Subunit: 124 residues, 4 copies
């Protein structure tokens, strides 16, 4: 599937977000080499340090089903420009994905920035 | 179901753990009010602080799929006595579950302790 | 020094808190067996999962100076009743302190609950 | 000062690390606009996810003492080439420091890479 369809999956994933403290909904969608998609959203805690990001939710759900080979991930939020993952998600993406895996950052108004896991974290 | 079946499901969940640094696999299985089961495992990182626990992987999976009403959780590891979740897991369960929700801590050699989300975190 | 003086140290520590997202200031003060006090406050991030608690700040600062034997800690916030540490701070306190180390939870209106590190985290 | 002196201070900071699980000591030293130095080290937990990095321990110490204006940081570990901070550390530095603040990554065998907070986290 193409980047436009994986972005839609992230738009759908995002609607499921648990965010009463920030009210800021993020969604992600991870695609395996076999073509399966894993959806993820952010999940907050009143104790802010325990908040979990969409990207990590999607990745942990894929690992938990025994899927380990990932080709791309799309990430979506209602920002002005597409905003990239926070530094802690980038680090997890580096652990679980290859340097060349595609990352499509997007917002709800059609903006798109394609990058890679490696480029997101210089020297990781 | 029953508690012995949710423990079996956690036993199976533990097999998917990603643990190359600690080598220590954990599994959890979460039961919804409707009787849906969600499995999780711990997922580690070379940066230790970014490691994620079994209980969280199950809970965040359920949230991401739209389930928010949980009746019980089982947690399993190769320990001597059954061990309770770490304090950060306890804090997540308090946010996402009711104080009366049932927690079965088990090992691979028979031992079972049953407790509750509330009893695990006094004053939370 | 007594619990009333360690609580004052926490009241002073709290004024230094970095919290633009929650605007909720916490302070702590850790006392060594030799009588030295370490002050700590919470420090937030726009990426909420990276927020750090007062208790952890105080503890990490004590370790970083080579102090390892702790007799008590006081914790203060502007809550109705004294509120206990979040589950992740409890876990760190367990790693670095003895089960019998004293914890004074307090607010700005004189309320005080004394407990212990061990009692804060059943079975840790 | 100079970069070689801040590196020496990180070399000293690393000696206080609490690392019984990874065994891997890291040090950091942070320099304020006024020329005050704050040292930190990594502090580990049996629950890997609760581990804290050197860079954070230094930064949170400075904040807790009222210093918020940072001109440079040095970070030191026993690696083959100098290694950059993990993504979660990068995200903290972005919040607490200016994009132009100077970062010296060093090892114990001569190697030095100088970079910046901004260069370490593109698009942050
Ligand atoms: Zn993130
Ligand atoms: Zn845990
Ligand atoms: Zn806390
Ligand atoms: Zn780090």
């Amino acid at each position: 599937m193409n980047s436009k369809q994986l972005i839609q999956e992230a738009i759908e994933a995002r609607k499921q977000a648990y965010v009463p403290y920030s009210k800021f909904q993020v969604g992600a969608a991870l695609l395996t080499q076999d073509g399966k998609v894993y959806r993820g959203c952010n999940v907050e805690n009143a104790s802010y340090g325990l908040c979990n990001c969409a990207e990590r939710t999607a990745l942990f759900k894929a690992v938990s089903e025994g899927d380990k080979e990932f080709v791309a991930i799309a990430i979506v939020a209602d920002t002005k420009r597409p905003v990239p993952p926070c530094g802690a998600c980038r680090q997890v993406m580096v652990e679980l994905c290859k340097q060349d895996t595609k990352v499509y950052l997007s917002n709800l108004h059609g903006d798109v920035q394609e990058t890679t896991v490696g480029e997101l974290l210089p020297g990781a």
